[PDB]
From a paper:
Diatoms are dominant marine algae and contribute around a quarter of global primary productivity, the success of which is largely attributed to their photosynthetic capacity aided by specific fucoxanthin chlorophyll-binding proteins (FCPs) to enhance the blue-green light absorption under water. Here, we solved the structures of a PSII-FCPII supercomplex and a trimeric FCP from C. meneghiniana by single particle analysis using cryo-EM, which revealed detailed structures of monomeric, dimeric and trimeric FCPs, as well as their binding to the PSII core. In conclusion, the cryo-EM structures of PSII-FCPII and the trimeric FCP of C. meneghiniana provide detailed insights into the structures of various FCP antennae and the assembly of FCPs within the PSII supercomplex.
Based on the analysis of the FCP bands by mass spectrometry and specific sequences obtained via transcriptome sequencing of C. meneghiniana and genomic sequence of C. cryptica, we assigned three FCP sequences to the local map of FCPII-G/H1/H2 adjacent to CP47/D2/PsbX/PsbH as Cc-Lhcx6_1, Cm-Lhcf7 and Cc-Lhcf7-like protein, respectively. We assigned 11 Chls a and 3 carotenoid sites in Cm-FCPII-G. One Dtx is identified at the 303 site of FCPII-G in the current structure, which shares the same location and orientation as Ddx303 in Cg-FCPII-D. Cm-FCPII-H1/H2 was identified as a heterodimer, despite of 80% sequence identity between them. FCPII-H1/H2 dimer is assembled in a “head-to-head” manner by two adjacent helices C, which resembles the Pt-Lhcf4 dimer. The binding of the FCPII-H dimer to the PSII core is dominated by the association of FCPII-H1 with FCPII-G in their loop regions with help of several crucial residues and pigments. Four carotenoids are assigned in each of FCPII-H1 and FCPII-H2, they are Fx 301/302 and Ddx 303/305. Thus FCPII-G and FCPII-H are both inner FCP antennae strongly associated with the PSII core and probably mediate EET from outside FCPs, and may also play photoprotection roles through the Ddx-Dtx cycle under high light conditions.
Author numbering:
A (entry chain 6): 36 to 199
B (entry chain 7): 23 to 186
C (entry chain 5): 37 to 205
The structure:
């Protein structure tokens, strides 16, 4: 499996701890599916952390609450009623397994020639977003359990313009 | 499909709306899988709506909440924090898709010359349990919105000795 | 330029400004590589050893006498000197076992094949050797820097970072 989309400089084939050693194409396909889905989720999650720092929807999630009062980070998993979170989870699942409001043919453009290049770019961005989402989670959760413990104030510490 | 498993004397082949005409055996397999899974879950429901009315486990589901105070039924949901609910949902999924913690071979017996009679018993029990859960949910929710509705203030009305 | 030594990496290439791996013998280059590997192994261990005891002093986790005056790991020479002496002695004994068993040319293969894990292919091995070497080089530099800095201004590593405004804790 040394020649399959994902081999890019600097590291030629990054399987240090021998995971692709004795596997059939089915297991590597499962691994690639997990990688691609994880990466997409991470990119969307990073964009989601950034954007509610300067824009919040105008509706009222949950009976009361309102979309403009909820905290932004690791919180907001404990400020939205559990029933709503479960319904969101199952809707994402419907889009995931059944693939429903998520297969519109206008979403598969004709990548004339550049198909492999764009697949490689998408995978690499997924990797970067997975690391970024880990960093954001660590900073927020640690500075929530003990306010401070990093010195760096603000949730998105890096883009100071958002004043947050 | 008028010979597949699932035909008993009261109402031999139940398909009034014609939902199983022209379908391929692959789908009818999926439909039967859904029926069995729903039936098992509904049995476990109609058994989990009754047990807490006289026996609460004792532990602490979340850092402050105790499974001695959270009301039973469609009310416990908004008590257990959403992160805990999620941490459950995903584990049940681990048992459901990747088949972990639920495939121990010494749980699958050899029904021998009964494997066509015990499966039917399981299916019919599931069919009854689904309707039982429907009724329990109706009573529980209708009274959780407007307390006193239907007059029977208790929960498991049909088992008065329990003192629901 | 090089003769097949697994080392040499993209950042630079074949780093040999002074011309040592041309004025040496076939056995001399082998000894040079062994020297490198061993120094690196020790260093890496020493860097981790500097980091963890010192941090345990910073966190008040070993009492209020662990590395008493300042917190420097170079202070064991004052508190518990005989412990350090006996530890160097035990290291010396196990390394005499090395010198006795291993033969010239090896001195790095501890025959720890089943007792541990290893990459299964061959290319990955070449990579793992290069890694071991690189981590060792960085650790050598780090150990020299730690010792020099601490001998300069008696102050632990994390505290030298906290003061002088280089961290945010
Ligand atoms: C009920 C809704 C639902 C359903 C039916 C599915 C169905 C599926 N997902 Mg999926 N997913 C969902 C919601 C759902 N997803 C949501 C909301 C997310 C977050 C964006 C994901 C993220 C996700 C990823 C990243 C992957 C899947 C994968 C899969 C496939 C099998 C693995 C699986 O689900 O077992 C679940 C088995 C587990 C062991 C669960 C792991 C639990 C993690 C490690 C920790 C949980 C943290 C905590 C509980 C949740 C906090 C986040 C939450 C508050 C948003 C299958 C098609 C995998 C796949 O395609 O193939 C491998 C895969 O890689 N999903
Ligand atoms: C849970 C997330 C996840 C998953 C399922 C995978 C899965 C995979 N990665 Mg991967 N990767 C991840 C996170 C993940 N990665 C992250 C965070 C990074 C950034 C450090 C990378 C960086 C990376 C590189 C650089 C390479 C892989 C490769 C691979 C494939 C073979 C290696 C393997 O897992 O065996 C496999 C499909 C290799 C590949 O493309 O195989 C063909 C490869 O060269 N990954
Ligand atoms: C169809 C349908 C129906 C009948 C409902 C009904 C409900 N939703 Mg809802 N929902 C739906 C589709 C539907 N949803 C869809 C398609 C989504 C997108 C995933 C959501 C996302 C959603 C959220 C995020 C929340 C609700 C909530 C609620 C409840 C509002 C509070 C209450 O008691 O009334 C209510 C039971 C709220 C809730 O559960 O509060 C208790 C809540 O926070 N819903
Ligand atoms: C929670 C709901 C949900 C989720 C997870 C997705 C997920 C996705 N949608 Mg999407 N979509 C949704 C609701 C959702 N959609 C709804 C309600 C509409 C109607 C407005 C669309 C209309 C839509 C289009 C038109 C396209 C997607 C596309 C996509 C994919 C990018 C991704 C799989 C793209 C594929 C694409 O082209 N979606
Ligand atoms: C999750 C809900 C669910 C699902 C997916 C099914 C699915 C199915 N049922 Mg079913 N059923 C259900 C709930 C459900 N049932 C309940 C609640 C009852 C009790 C009233 C029944 C009572 C029932 C009977 C009595 C029969 C079916 C039959 C069938 C099969 C063909 C009819 C059809 O749906 O098309 C199909 C596999 C038929 C069957 O098994 O034919 C082989 C059949 O005769 N069902
Ligand atoms: C991460 C958790 C997780 C995951 C990955 C799965 C994965 C799966 N489940 Mg599953 N399940 C779970 C948790 C999970 N389950 C839990 C906690 C329960 C309740 C005990 C169930 C009850 C359940 C049933 C009863 C059925 C499945 C089915 C399935 C399969 C397809 C599901 C589908 O199309 O999407 C989900 C698609 C939807 C449209 C969601 C519908 C949700 C209903 C309409 C209302 C939900 C309201 C909420 C509050 C798949 C193997 C089905 C199956 O195997 O055959 C088809 C099936 O019949 N599951
Ligand atoms: C909480 C998640 C969960 C779920 C949904 C199930 C679900 C199931 N288990 Mg199970 N199980 C679980 C946790 C779970 N188990 C744990 C934590 C253990 C370890 C004690 C077991 C040990 C276990 C055994 C030994 C057996 C099951 C069996 C079963 C099936 C009956 C059913 C699918 C049976 C199949 C069976 O024989 N389970
Ligand atoms: C005792 C320490 C030591 C030794 C013996 C070696 C030995 C070697 N290194 Mg090396 N290296 C070291 C430390 C050491 N390294 C450190 C700390 C770094 C990080 C800066 C590097 C970075 C490095 C690179 C980037 C490369 C080598 C390469 C080599 C090989 C060819 C160079 C040569 O002939 O030997 C060089 C060493 C000596 C002849 C003896 C030590 C040097 C003098 C005596 C020290 C002088 C005091 C010093 C300046 C104080 C600071 C050889 C096996 C090259 C290689 O892989 O070749 C294929 C190569 O490309 N090394
Ligand atoms: C036992 C058995 O049977 O099989 C074994 C076989 C074998 C091969 C032994 C095994 C292995 C592999 C092992 C043990 C690998 C270990 C690798 C290891 C331990 C590698 C350390 C690197 C540390 C570095 C580079 C330090 C950086 C530190 C740097 C660069 C610094 O800047 C330090 C710093 O101080 C400066 C200089 C200035 C200060 O102001 C600031 C700070 C403090 C930041 C296994 C897997 O265990 C199995
Ligand atoms: C246990 C518990 C909880 C729970 C729970 C859960 C998971 C409850 C689950 C409830 C569930 C799973 C309810 C399914 C019903 C499916 C039905 C009724 C199907 C009907 C289908 C019927 C009536 C008939 C269909 C057809 O006849 C038609 C119309 C024409 C024919 O041709 C074909 C057939 C015969 C098929 C809470 C709430 C999470 C918190 C609480 O604290 C603890």
């Amino acid at each position: 499996f040394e020649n399959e989309l994902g081999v890019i400089a600097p590291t030629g084939f990054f399987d240090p701890l021998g995971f692709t050693q004795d596997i059939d194409q089915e297991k590597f396909d499962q691994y690639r599916t997990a990688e691609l889905k994880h990466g997409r989720v991470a990119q969307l999650a990073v964009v989601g952390y950034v954007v509610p720092e300067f824009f919040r929807w105008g509706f009222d999630i949950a009976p009361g609450i309102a979309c403009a009062d909820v905290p932004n980070g690791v919180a907001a998993i404990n400020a939205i009623p559990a029933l709503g979170w479960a319904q969101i989870i199952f809707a994402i699942g419907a889009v995931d397994v059944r693939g429903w409001f998520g297969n519109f043919d206008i979403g598969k453009p004709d990548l004339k020639g550049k198909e492999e290049e764009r697949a490689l770019q998408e995978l690499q961005h997924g990797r970067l977003a997975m690391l970024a989402i880990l960093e954001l989670l660590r900073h927020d959760s640690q500075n929530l359990v003990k306010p401070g413990f990093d010195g760096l104030d603000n949730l998105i510490t890096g883009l100071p313009f958002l004043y947050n | 499909f008028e010979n597949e498993l699932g035909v008993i004397a009261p109402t031999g082949f139940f398909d009034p709306l014609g939902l199983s005409k022209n379908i391929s055996k692959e789908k009818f397999d999926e439909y039967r899988t859904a029926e069995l899974k729903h039936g098992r879950a509904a049995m476990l429901a109609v058994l989990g709506y009754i047990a807490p009315e006289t026996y609460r486990f004792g532990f602490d589901i979340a850092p402050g909440v105790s499974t001695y105070d959270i009301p039973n039924g469609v009310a416990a949901i908004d008590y257990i924090p959403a992160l805990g609910w999620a941490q459950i949902i995903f584990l049940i999924g681990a048992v459901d898709y990747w088949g972990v913690l639920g495939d121990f071979s010494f749980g699958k017996p050899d029904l021998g010359d009964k494997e066509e009679e015990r499966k039917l018993q399981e299916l019919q029990h599931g069919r009854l349990a689904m309707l039982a859960f429907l009724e329990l949910l109706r009573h529980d929710s209708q009274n959780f919105v407007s307390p006193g509705f239907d007059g029977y203030d208790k929960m498991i009305t049909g088992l008065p000795f329990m003192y629901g | 330029a090089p003769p097949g030594l697994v080392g040499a990496l993209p950042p630079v290439g074949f780093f040999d400004p002074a011309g040592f791996a041309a004025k040496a013998s076939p056995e001399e280059l082998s000894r040079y590589r062994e020297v490198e590997i061993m120094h690196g192994r020790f260093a890496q261990l020493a860097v981790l050893g500097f980091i963890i005891p010192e941090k345990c002093a910073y966190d008040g986790s070993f009492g209020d006498d662990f590395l008493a005056p300042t917190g420097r790991a170079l202070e064991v020479f004052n508190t518990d000197p005989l412990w350090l002496g006996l530890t160097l002695a035990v290291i010396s004994a196990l390394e005499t076992v090395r010198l006795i068993e291993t033969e010239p040319g090896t001195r790095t293969d501890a025959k720890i094949e089943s007792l541990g894990w290893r990459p299964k292919t061959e290319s990955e091995y070449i990579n793992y050797q290069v890694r071991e070497l690189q981590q060792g080089r960085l650790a050598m530099l780090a150990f020299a820097g730690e010792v020099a800095q601490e001998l300069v201004n008696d102050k632990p590593l994390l505290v030298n970072l906290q003061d002088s405004g280089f961290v945010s804790w």
